[model samples]
Target: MVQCEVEAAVSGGHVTLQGVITAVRDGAGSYKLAVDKAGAAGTSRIKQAGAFTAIAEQRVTVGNVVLDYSSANRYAARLDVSFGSVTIQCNLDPETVKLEH
Candidate 1:
């Protein structure tokens, strides 16, 4: 497993979501991630983000899924950090969130 040092700021504690994805995406692929944060009303989308270590999956899925979202509220997926930079549409699960295997 490749570990990258991440320094982030929480505009509302959004980094928690990315960390959730990274912590699990060790090297094997992941699926069905559910992220409920930032006061989101309910579970978010579940797009694919592949492996966190590879860096390829992370970029491809951007703007395609909502990592943290709700029915009435808006959620973002900041790449490095911010929750606003990310463009993907997925509801990433902490347990299933794993690196490409």
Candidate 2:
């Protein structure tokens, strides 16, 4: 494993977070979606949210299917589809990337 800095440090945690969707990538059995935000403090691999966090390498998906896990273009071919500033739920699918908040 690699080292990471805190990205969401706070006195109280939140159940939901509104931020920008940045990028996406591949992972073990799921995918990484770059919901880029600004902060510090962080988690396990299942439902990650908020700053100093991690997601995406090229293209990816979360609990969502249809995203071919083999193509890098799945997340990288087009960057515009994932650049919106929205509230996250926990993960991604490039087209449906969000946080599981």
Candidate 3:
């Protein structure tokens, strides 16, 4: 399994959402993020930054957002989370968020 590090900041968002997630990707190439169990009262869209998808849920804050990589190729992927009109993103690769596969 690839143990990734979270080296991102409050890059973009109305407010920041960070929780219990030390690792970012799994061996299966799924991106993961954690949020508050009692999050905001708005819908969420968690996907990989741009083309990749991370989760299929429209709501988060109660659990982790684990989005699939679409294939077996483990390339660099970022987390794109949209809650309300504000969205936040973080790169899950080296130089930013290092990936130790």
Candidate 4:
């Protein structure tokens, strides 16, 4: 498993999610951003800015909330976060959220 540092920010009550994807398996892997739980209605989308090859804007429904991602294969990935249409809380620090696989 790789330890990933996740980051987010809030401006004008909007949340921006950011994180790093490391090459843990054969120097490459796919990325997925998911919301385990949320308090209200909002839209989240991943920005296309990384070393990923064939980055895709895709959406998958988990239970009921629809989460989106710019998924791709790369040795390391840099993600830009975006959220809208709801009340956002908490300004995230780089170490506040972590990604594991």
* Top candidate by lDDT: 1
Per-residue lDDT of model 4, residues 36-100, tens digit only: 32323443333342223222222211111222222221112233222222111222232432331
If ranked by lDDT, best first, what sequence of candidates would result?
A: 1, 3, 4, 2
Model 3 / residue 17 / CA error / Å:
20
- Which residue pairs show collisions in model 3? 54-67
Model 1 RMSD, rounded to 1 decimal: 12.3
What overall lDDT, based on C-alpha atoms, would model 1 receive against the true structure? 0.30
Model 4, runs deviating above 4 Å: 1-3, 22-28, 40-101
Candidate 2 wrong stretches, greater than 4 Å: 1-32, 40-100
Q: Which is the winner by lDDT between candidate 1 and candidate 3?
A: 1
- For all candidates in order, the CA lDDT equals 0.30, 0.25, 0.29, 0.29
lDDT of 1 by residue, 49-72 (tens): 343223432422322332332233
TM-score of each: 0.23, 0.14, 0.23, 0.29
What pairs collide in candidate 4? none
Report the C-alpha lDDT of model 3 over 1-101, residue by residue, as the tens digit.
12222322222222233222222332122334432112233333443222222223221221234322222222233444443333454444323212221
Reference-based lDDT, residue 91, model 3: 44
Per TM-score, the best of the predicted structures is 4
